[PDB]
Amino acid sequence: QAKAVARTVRIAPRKARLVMDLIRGKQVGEAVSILNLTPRAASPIIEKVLKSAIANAEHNYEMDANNLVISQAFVDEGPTLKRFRPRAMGRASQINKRTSHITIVVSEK
Amino acid sequence: MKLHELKPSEGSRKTRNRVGRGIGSGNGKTAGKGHKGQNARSGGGVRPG
Amino acid sequence: PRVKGGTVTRKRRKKVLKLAKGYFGSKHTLYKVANQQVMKSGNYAFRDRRQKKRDFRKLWITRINAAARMNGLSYSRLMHGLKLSGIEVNRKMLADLAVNDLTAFNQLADAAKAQLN
């Protein structure tokens, strides 16, 4: 089979979770159509890594790109970045610029 | 004697009573000072007479 | 010398958590909330070990009573006849018979019924 990863990308993981919960277990071409047509911030990232995956398969494994399926696809919360918003009255509020590790695995039928 | 068969005379040695080290000991949560009062405090007491 | 205490605490708490499997979420995931259920489970277990003796007794008795009512008797009247006879077997045996070998139960009940007269 084949794998692709996008490690340490500034985006919240839940949002990516939504976008790939759409496509978990689908053919690659229709999945690309989903990501191209759905209006979310994470679809370009996800189609990017997916396209890299199928490239890895075709180049390093020769697994007949059209005959492919998302075996699995998931997101892992990566290292956040800490920030502070100066709220009223000298108090600050902690801000969690999240980060995600996207992972996709592609196989045949 | 030999350093790897040492032993004392019985009754010469004892284990010291630690406190604040659980309730199975019977000296937990108070170290035998009971509950509140001038005798239960740090530096707590009075002059002897 | 100085003493940290790194491994002991972890080991003990993990032992507790392994005891606390199957509990609802945090009560298997977290140490202390699980501890205070495990402990509670210990008291409940002590209690239930002694309630078994009280529950199976009831069950046996109900079974015996049903069988005696179809034989034409009450539990109380039956067991009085049996103790009066010498048939002090026990209620668990009587129940097992009343389920499996009801003819033997009838034999015994007929003995007691006769000796009530």
Binding site: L18, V19, D21, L22, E30, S33, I34, N36, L37, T38, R40 | - | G25, S26
Partner: protein
């Protein structure tokens, strides 16, 4: 005006059930094949209803 208790994972997930995305209403581009929104233009074919812009 605050949570009297912390919300558990189970109810958190039960709430987030409906929090999800439906797919689009999708169709092909009959001109050059690829997929497309219903009643909308094929960005790559640049076509719609058998007509190019």
């Amino acid at each position: 005006a605050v949570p009297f208790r912390r919300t558990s994972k189970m109810k958190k997930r039960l709430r987030r059930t409906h929090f999800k995305l439906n797919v689009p209403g999708m169709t092909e581009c009959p001109s050059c094949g690829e997929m497309k929104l219903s009643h909308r233009v094929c960005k790559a074919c640049g076509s719609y209803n058998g007509k190019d812009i």
